[PDB]
Each structure stands twice: as C-alpha cells, then as structure tokens.
C-alpha cells in the first residue's frame, strides 16, 4: 500500500553509511553511491540550465558547458577521494580471507623431468625464500563439475516425476537428440531421470574423479602460491619473476569464492587467438541491433500512419529496445567467459566495459541514423544492380524508471518464471529454484548509469528538460536500491570498489563525448571563436581524468606495503598464536 | 694518411661485439647497435625502391609502402631481442653497484617531532623490516658545491696569471659587475684572482660546511634507503609504500656517480608547477628556430640572385641550420634539469624526447612551409593595419657526413678551443681543461639517427634516392663511431641499455608518420582503394609496437626478482664474508 512503501523509504532513510559498509559491503555502498554523484552533478547544472537556457533562449551555451563540465569534475574528484579512503579503511577493517597471502602464477614453464608443482616449488623457495608457505597446483576438473551438475540435475528434474503421484509417474518422453528427431523423443522410460542416467552419471562422476587425481594432465600449467605474510603476497603480486615476461606470471589471486573455475585451464597460448575473435564478434553485434531497431521502429510508424498519441509511438519506440537489451546483457557475460577471465570480477567488468561500447553507438552516437543510412545506400545498389532528444525523455520515462518500478516490485524473478513458462514442456520446470539475489548488477546497472550520464551531459547545454528527468531517476534509485541492499541484495565476491577506477573512466568519457558533439552544433557557422573555446575542454577533462588517476586509482589498483603490514602485525598481536597453513592449502585445488 | 685511415678501419673491425661488451660497455655498444639497425632496414628496402620505383616511373607504391614497413618492423624486433638478452646478460655478468642495493624515497611526510632520518628508519624498519639495512638522508649541499667549485676556478683562472711571468704578473681588470660597469672593470689588485677572493672563498667553504653539517634544513624530505639484497631493493623499488600516493615514493636509486646532486633540493610540490614552465618554453623555442631558418634561407637566395650552384645553394641553406641547432643540443640540456630530474641519464633521455619534437616540426613537417605561411599572413595584416627531397638529400651530405668526418678528426674539442677564442678576453682562456670524453651522445646522436629514419621512411616510397645517401651515413656511422669507442669514447654512467625502449619509440613514431604523410600524397585523388590500404598500416605498426612492448620492453624497465636472487647467491657464495653496510652507507651523501 501507499503507507507501506513511504515507511519502506523512511526506514532506508534511518540506516547510516558505515553501518551499511558491514551490513551490506563495500561494493554496494560505493555502487550506491554513484546515484548519489549523480544527483550531485545533474542537481546544480540544472538550476544553471534553468536560468541560462529557458530564459534567454550562442556564447551562452559555450559557458554554461564549462560550467556544466566544471562542477561535473569537481564531484568527480570529491567522490574518488570518498570511495578511495572508503575502500583502504575497509581494507584495513576487515577479516581473514585466503586471496590476502596468495598469487596465481600462470604460464608456468615446460618441464621434461618435473612435474608442474616440483617446479613451481623450487621456483618459489629460491626466489622468494623466506616467505614461500604452500603452493597449489590448479587442476582441470571442468568435466567432473559437469559431470557433477548433470547428476544433481537429472535427480531434481525428475524428482518431481517420481513424487508428483509416485508409483509410474509420468513418464515423459522429450528429446533425446534434437538433430534427430524433433518436437519430443519416444524415451518413456522409468522415473528419476531414466534412473539409468543417474546412475551411469554417477559412475563416470567416479571415472572422472579417477583420472583428475590421478592423471598429471589435468593439473594445468598454474598454481596458487600462498605467502606467510600479506606483505609477501603484495610484493610477489606486483613484482616481476623472471626474465621471459611471458612464463611465471604473477598477480594477486582473488577470493577462493570468485575464482571462475572454468576459465583456469585455457592455455597462456590461446588466449590472444581468442581475444581476436570475440573482439570481432562484438562488432558485429552492435551494428546487428542497430538494425533490427531500425526495422521495428518503422513497423510502429506504419502502424500508427494505419490507424498524447505522439507521446505512445516514443514509448513504444523506447520499448522493443527494452526486450533486446533484455537478451543484450543475458549475452555480454557469455563471451567474456569465451576470451578466457579467472575472475568473477574481470568477467563482470568486462561486460560492463563491452556494454558501454554497445550503448555509446546503438543508442546515441551511431544509432538510428546512421545505421539506416547505410542500409539506403544498400536499398539503392538493390535497386540498380545527437539523435533526438525527446527519443531519450522516453528512454529516461521507461528504461529508468521502469527499472526501478520493477526492481521494488521484485517481479523479475515472477519474469524468469514466466520466461520458464515461455519455454514451457509442459507449463513448469524442474524442482530447482536457483533464486540467489546475486550481485546488485555492475554488469547491468552500471552500463544504465553511464548511459544517463552521456544522456544528461550531452543534452544539457541543448535541452534543459532531459536533466529534471535524469534527476528523479538517480533520486528514486537511491531510495529503491537502497532498500533493497538492506532488505534484499546480498553479494557474491568482495573486490571492495575494485571497479570505481572503470566508473570514473566512462564519466570521463562522457563528458568528452559531450564537448566533442558540441563542438559540431556549436562549431558549424556560429563563431570561429566559439570553435577554439570548445576546443579546450576536452584537454582540460582529460587533464583531470589523469590527475584524479595519479591521486586516487592506485588505492584500487595497488596494496601499499605498508598497509599490509599493519594488518599483519595487528592480527599477529590480537591472535599470536594462529595457523596459516591450515587456511591457505586447502583454498586453491578445484572445488570438487 | 690514407693508409692510417685504412688501417684504423680494420682494426675497429677486428674485434669482436661481447669483448666491446666489457671494453667499452653496453650502452655504447647498443647505441652502435643502432647504426647497425638502420643497415638492417635501409638496405633491403633501397634494393625494392630500385626494382618497383626507377624502373617502373599508383599502386605500386602502397605495396612498396607495406614491404617496407614489415620489413622495418620485421628488424626493430629482431634487434629488440638482441638488446633486450644483452642487457639481462650484461646485467647479470657486472659488478657491485650502490644503486642495486638502494631506493630513493622522496617526499618523506612532515614531522613536528621527528627528523627526517628518524622517520625515515621508522618507517622503513616496520614496512621492510628483514632487509632494511641503512638510510642515508639527502642533503643540500649545492651552495657547499658551487663555493668548492668557485674556489677552483679561482685558483686555477690566475694561476695562469700568477705563474706567466711571477712577481707582479698581468694584474687585468675585467668586468666585477657587468651590469654596472661595461666592457672590463678597474680592479688591477693582485694575483690568484685577487686571493682576497680565494680567501674569502675559503672561509666561505667553510661556513656553508659547517651549516650544512648541523643545520638539519639542508636534508632535504628525501633518503635513500639502502637494503640488504638485490631482490629486497627490487621489492621496495617496484613496490607502492603507504596510501597517500604522492609520500614515501620509492623508486630504485641510480648509480651515486650518475646522481644529479642540484636536483636532489626540488620540493615535490613545485616540480609540477616548474614543469608547466619548462612545457610551454620549449613550445615557444621550437616555432622561433622555424623563423631564423627561413629568413637565412631568404638571404642565401638574395645573395645567389644578386651573384652545381643550385647544389651550392641547397647545401648552404644546408648548413645555417647546422650552427642553430649545434645552439640546440647545447639548451635542451638546460631545459630538463629546469625541470628537476636527478639523474643524468633522464636528464640526458630527456633531451632526446624533446629534441624530437623539434626536429619533427621545424625539419620536415611544420617547418620552411608552414612557419613562413604564417608570417606571409602577419605581412598581410601588416600591409592593411613533406617538404622537399632535394633539401634533405644535402643535409645528410652535410649533418650525417659532415658529422662523422668531424667526428674521426677529432676537431671538435678543436673548434671548443675556438669558441674559446670568440670568447676571447685576451686570446687564451683559464688553465681549466676539461677535456673528458663524456658519453658517445644520446642527447646529440640518437636525435640524428631517428631524424634520418624519418626522412628515410618516410621518402622511400616517394624518392629512391636518399636512401644510397642515408644509407652510406650509416656505414659510415658505425666504422668511425666505434673506431671511436675502442679507441677515444669512455663513459659517465652506466644505464645498460635502458634507453632502447625510446629509441624504438621513435623510429615506430617515423614508421606511423610516415604511413600518414603517404596517405596524403596517395590518398588525394589517385583512388578510393588506394586510401583504406593506407589506413590499416598505422594500426599494424601500433600493433607490432604494442607487442614488442610487451616483450621486450619489461627488460628494461624491470628487474626480474628470479635475476636478482640469481645474482645475490652466487656472489654471496664467491665471496662467503662480506660487509654492505660499508659500501652502502657512505655512498649517497652529497659529495661535498
């Protein structure tokens, strides 16, 4: 009810920031807190845009640009200060996590008389002697976790075809090899997943578990090596091993709960041949949806001619977009696993990284326009063998705040099981119920953000009617996500804003982005003294970028020695007597 | 003679590369490596300028473009290699050094109750506490310096005019203040510099000695802390020490005979200010020399019409070029230590880097056009209140081949001694005689050799001509260069090779500008398949670029930690006994 939600709200309201840190974490604090930058930077440039536009509407609008782009600096700075010391004191305050003493050495060199771990051994107690502890090779252990999956799968699937009514339950037969036959199979069969599966499943989980043992092929040319001492850790993370830069590559190891254990068995060799490939794929998948878009937009258009009313044509519009990004984000994690990450972390970067490239062009720069450009140019070889601002004010009316509508309604879970009932054998599922919140979304709230930031600093010095839009959407995301890192939203792994230095980038872009466009609407005929006006901005935010990078980034980038060995040496005090062997050997191997 | 000459000739070339390793050393010996690079390009590439070129004068000359291009990068990898093992080889096989114990910790915090040593060791004994072995603070002794200096130059000016003739010797007067009194002065006085002064000088010594000693403002806020190991060293110096990014900056420490002791007295907050000086003045500089060129130019041209000649002329404007920029090297020297490094070898790589730039514009492009253009557009105002193959083919004639014939007559320290003579207060100078060798030239040489790959490259596809000449340059570079380094050139610090990362820069700069200008004499018009060809070349060099700086580059730029535990258990077993903190300690006090 109306008082239901305005109490949910006071009661986020009433919770502190730091109580949060350790309620909720550090990464959904400062992920919080880029809503409230933005409501920090789109709050003031629209009292100015409110004052310098509407009343006198132009050397007005090259001024308020640097304005606009002044204060947008200013709480940039300020905020990578706040997050900077936020993460070192959380950094500090923490607890004992096995990430903290050890590094991933990839690439380790061929051995005709060794085995990977006497080699990584002997490496290790030559080269960093007096703090080497355990070192534990990486194995290959991919098949027996699918092998593992499928047999919890088969069990749960037809657990409910075995208990719904018991005795012969239903036996369904669906598809035993769809490139056979096709709609369904003739596989009757028994109950528990043909029992017969389970059981032939459990036995190759038994050859499996055999061989990885007991094969030295599946253990790949990796391990984990552990250190005594946060100090020692840091320095092998950030110090180079041996003359060929390409064998015994150190980097800090991340939390033993993040490891994407898949990707730890890709070879150092292939990598860069994959990289090239999915490189190219994601090209094509940007211009691709420009396209249908395009395509889909002119079907709403004939629709309308056929049969406010100009106000639903950009809302619908602003959807079809919605249900294809909808698949989009589904998609960019798939193929940052497919160059080949270790890391729940860079894989979710990556995506965010790779959607922001997609959002730049699809929907702002390169969208529309040109796209359906080139296909008339294409339509006539057939024939002889900033986009708009109010597009976005739509955007803003469905995408954001649609968003946040639905985040508070937690119908998106409702949504995959209704996405279930698309699929739909029958009109259910299995009897799994994978409904872990998971991470707030930096791989898909993020790439929102971002994309409002271009919206509104593009469109501020043009439109002063996008940023009141923009403002309600950061101030009802605060409130609404809020709630729910209280209520809801747990975590996954804990990079303790390892990702501000990628957020600060991307504002950085916008605002170049921004100055570049406006040196095309207000460099055009309008003054050629305008023109060099505009022409400094971009030096100047890039000078910014570079500062607040040299000032604030290497607290996210780089563990100061120092602050390592204060945490050793306090833990060593409060706790004098404790293992570490215990706690790091047993961190590494395959969880299987 | 000619036979002498011959002779110098095989004898430079009787002797082997690795006994030049330890003869001369390693920078020398891969800055010969560089002549020898340019053989290595420039040869096979006049070979297919004399086959698709003369004989066929266009799409010949993209493909021409492309060969030459994979053929140069084809080298500068190969040559990498190469430089990249001798340095790890070199650095392995040496000696002990003070620099691959220490690290110099600048911008050491403010303490109200602590020196800077006490903080200092604090610090350094709970942060590096296993491996910290002594700390020596950094002091201002360059008043100390410029008063010792003072005093010999006193002394040894009138020990000349003490010692002629004796008794009353050549009592002269010149200027005491110049900005009082002009030409000379009235002070006929005595003898060694009216020995009041050597006195005086003397006593001053002595009270800037005793200052400096116990003051405690001389130190500056820096130190540099010594360790017990290579490996600790390498640690502290690639490791970042405390949050605040800007205190405790450790970087490894250079050799105490390289140490630009002036520098080591800049605070960290005014380096920044100062560099924006020192930005914008060499800006300032590079379009000025512009001017002087073509107004000279102008006179040369004045003269011949008032009067092969035209062979005369060019090489003639060739020259006035020659004594401006001999004016050059002579300032960028300066410039970098305006700038505050402290150490010869930045200070030396610093020149380098900006004498690039220079040459970039005021010698191919932006320079006789460009400049000139603008100052027909000032006359105008005033009234109503690649350059050409030809020029550049009498340069090498005249700076490269000028160069080295001076070079093997020695007559440089020659024409000092004549600069002497222009100075001429009477018709000699002082009985100060440096006459030390000094290095080969990376301030003065390298800028030439990257100049000429330019021109090289850069006209390769267009004139098949100045390669012979760039050509024989080389080969004569090498010859008499090396001569040199056997016989006359010694060395004032040793950097092994650490300067190969910009070298390699800058020929890959002249490969990209190269492919850019040639995109503008075959992009314009000729065909709109000729330009996409064009526009994939800048990439692939970007590229291969990228990766040799990913494999080569680490070489240089760090030290394996592997190499130095290598390094620290051999000689800790070829010598068993052995004392550091004596040679470590007293190393990085001011030599005063």
């Given at each position: 009810?109306?008082?239901?939600?305005?109490?949910?709200?006071?009661?986020?309201?009433?919770?502190?920031?730091?109580?949060?840190?350790?309620?909720?974490?550090?990464?959904?604090?400062?992920?919080?807190?880029?809503?409230?930058?933005?409501?920090?930077?789109?709050?003031?440039?629209?009292?100015?845009?409110?004052?310098?536009?509407?009343?006198?509407?132009?050397?007005?609008?090259?001024?308020?640009?640097?304005?606009?782009?002044?204060?947008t600096?200013?709480?940039?700075?300020?905020?990578?200060?706040?997050?900077?010391?936020?993460?070192?004191?959380?950094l500090?305050?923490?607890?004992?996590?096995?990430?903290?003493?050890?590094?991933?050495?990839?690439?380790?060199?061929?051995?005709?008389?060794?085995?990977?771990?006497?080699?990584?051994?002997?490496?290790?107690?030559?080269?960093?002697?007096?703090?080497?502890?355990?070192?534990?090779?990486?194995?290959?252990?991919?098949?027996?976790?699918?092998?593992?999956?499928?047999?919890?799968?088969?069990?749960?699937?037809l657990?409910?075809?075995?208990?719904?009514?018991?005795?012969?339950?239903?036996?369904?037969?669906?598809?035993?090899?769809?490139?056979?036959?096709?709609?369904?199979?003739?596989?009757?069969?028994?109950?528990?997943?043909?029992?017969?599966?389970?059981?032939?499943?459990?036995?190759?989980?038994?050859?499996?578990?055999?061989?990885?043992?007991?094969?030295?092929?599946?253990?790949?040319?990796?391990?984990?090596?552990?250190?005594?001492?946060?100090?020692?850790?840091?320095?092998?993370?950030?110090?180079?091993?041996?003359?060929?830069?390409?064998?015994?590559?150190?980097?800090?190891?991340?939390?033993?709960?993040?490891?994407?254990?898949?990707n730890?068995?890709?070879?150092?060799?292939?990598?860069?041949?994959?990289?090239?490939?999915?490189?190219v794929?994601?090209?094509?998948?940007?211009?691709?949806?420009?396209?249908?878009?395009?395509?889909?937009?002119?079907?709403?258009?004939?629709?309308?001619?056929?049969?406010?009313?100009?106000?639903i044509?950009?809302?619908?519009?602003?959807?079809a977009?919605?249900?294809?990004?909808?698949?989009?984000?589904?998609?960019?994690?798939?193929?940052?696993?497919?160059?080949?990450f270790?890391?729940?972390?860079?894989?979710?970067?990556?995506?965010?990284?790779?959607?922001?490239?997609?959002?730049?062009?699809?929907?702002?720069?390169?969208?529309?326009?040109?796209?359906?450009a080139?296909?008339?140019?294409?339509?006539?070889?057939?024939q002889?063998?900033?986009?708009?601002?109010?597009?976005?004010?739509?955007?803003?009316?469905?995408?954001?705040?649609?968003?946040?509508?639905?985040?508070?309604?937690?119908?998106?879970?409702?949504?995959?099981?209704?996405?279930?009932?698309?699929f739909?054998?029958?009109?259910?599922?299995?009897?799994?119920?994978?409904?872990?919140?998971?991470?707030?979304?930096?791989?898909?709230?993020?790439?929102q953000?971002?994309?409002?930031?271009?919206?509104?600093?593009?469109?501020?010095p043009?439109?002063?009617?996008?940023?009141?839009?923009?403002?309600?959407?950061?101030?009802?995301?605060?409130?609404?996500?809020?709630?729910?890192?209280?209520?809801?939203?747990?975590?996954?792994?804990?990079?303790?804003?390892?990702?501000?230095?990628?957020?600060?980038?991307?504002?950085?872009?916008?605002?170049?982005?921004?100055?570049?466009?406006?040196?095309?609407?207000?460099?055009?005929?309008?003054?050629?003294?305008?023109?060099?006006?505009?022409?400094?901005?971009?030096?100047?935010?890039?000078?910014?970028?570079?500062?607040?990078?040299?000032?604030?980034?290497?607290?996210?980038?780089?563990?100061?020695?120092?602050?390592?060995?204060?945490?050793?040496?306090?833990?060593?005090?409060?706790?004098?007597?404790?293992?570490?062997?215990?706690?790091?050997?047993?961190?590494?191997?395959?969880?299987?």
């Amino acid at each position: 009810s109306y008082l239901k939600f305005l109490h949910w709200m006071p009661e986020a309201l009433k919770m502190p920031e730091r109580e949060l840190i350790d309620h909720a974490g550090l990464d959904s604090v400062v992920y919080l807190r880029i809503y409230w930058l933005g409501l920090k930077i789109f709050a003031p440039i629209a009292m100015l845009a409110w004052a310098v536009l509407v009343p006198v509407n132009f050397w007005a609008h090259i001024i308020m640009a640097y304005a606009f782009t002044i204060w947008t600096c200013y709480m940039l700075m300020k905020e990578y200060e706040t997050v900077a010391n936020m993460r070192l004191q959380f950094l500090a305050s923490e607890g004992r996590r096995p990430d903290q003493f050890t590094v991933l050495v990839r690439n380790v060199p061929p051995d005709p008389d060794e085995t990977v771990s006497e080699l990584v051994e002997h490496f290790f107690l030559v080269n960093h002697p007096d703090n080497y502890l355990t070192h534990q090779v990486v194995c290959n252990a991919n098949k027996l976790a699918d092998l593992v999956s499928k047999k919890t799968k088969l069990q749960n699937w037809l657990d409910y075809y075995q208990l719904k009514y018991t005795r012969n339950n239903s036996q369904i037969r669906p598809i035993t090899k769809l490139g056979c036959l096709g709609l369904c199979g003739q596989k009757v069969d028994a109950i528990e997943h043909y029992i017969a599966e389970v059981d032939k499943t459990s036995k190759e989980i038994a050859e499996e578990r055999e061989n990885v043992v007991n094969d030295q092929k599946s253990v790949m040319p990796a391990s984990f090596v552990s250190f005594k001492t946060r100090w020692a850790a840091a320095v092998c993370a950030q110090t180079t091993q041996t003359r060929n830069p390409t064998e015994w590559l150190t980097e800090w190891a991340a939390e033993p709960r993040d490891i994407y254990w898949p990707n730890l068995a890709i070879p150092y060799v292939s990598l860069t041949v994959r990289r090239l490939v999915m490189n190219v794929a994601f090209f094509f998948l940007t211009f691709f949806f420009i396209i249908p878009i395009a395509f889909v937009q002119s079907l709403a258009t004939i629709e309308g001619i056929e049969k406010i009313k100009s106000l639903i044509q950009g809302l619908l519009a602003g959807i079809a977009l919605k249900l294809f990004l909808i698949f989009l984000p589904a998609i960019l994690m798939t193929m940052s696993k497919f160059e080949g990450f270790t890391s729940v972390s860079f894989l979710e970067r990556r995506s965010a990284s790779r959607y922001y490239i997609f959002n730049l062009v699809n929907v702002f720069l390169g969208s529309v326009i040109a796209g359906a450009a080139f296909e008339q140019l294409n339509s006539f070889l057939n024939q002889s063998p900033p986009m708009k601002a109010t597009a976005f004010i739509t955007y803003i009316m469905v995408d954001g705040w649609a968003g946040v509508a639905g985040e508070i309604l937690m119908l998106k879970p409702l949504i995959i099981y209704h996405l279930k009932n698309a699929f739909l054998v029958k009109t259910e599922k299995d009897r799994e119920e994978a409904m872990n919140p998971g991470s707030i979304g930096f791989n898909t709230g993020e790439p929102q953000i971002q994309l409002y930031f271009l919206l509104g600093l593009v469109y501020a010095p043009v439109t002063p009617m996008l940023l009141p839009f923009i403002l309600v959407f950061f101030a009802l995301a605060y409130v609404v996500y809020r709630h729910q890192i209280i209520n809801v939203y747990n975590q996954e792994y804990e990079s303790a804003a390892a990702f501000w230095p990628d957020v600060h980038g991307r504002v950085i872009t916008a605002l170049i982005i921004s100055q570049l466009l406006l040196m095309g609407l207000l460099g055009t005929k309008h003054a050629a003294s305008a023109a060099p006006f505009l022409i400094a901005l971009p030096v100047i935010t890039i000078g910014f970028h570079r500062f607040c990078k040299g000032r604030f980034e290497p607290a996210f980038v780089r563990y100061p020695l120092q602050e390592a060995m204060m945490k050793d040496t306090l833990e060593r005090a409060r706790e004098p007597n404790l293992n570490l062997k215990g706690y790091l050997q047993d961190a590494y191997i395959h969880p299987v």
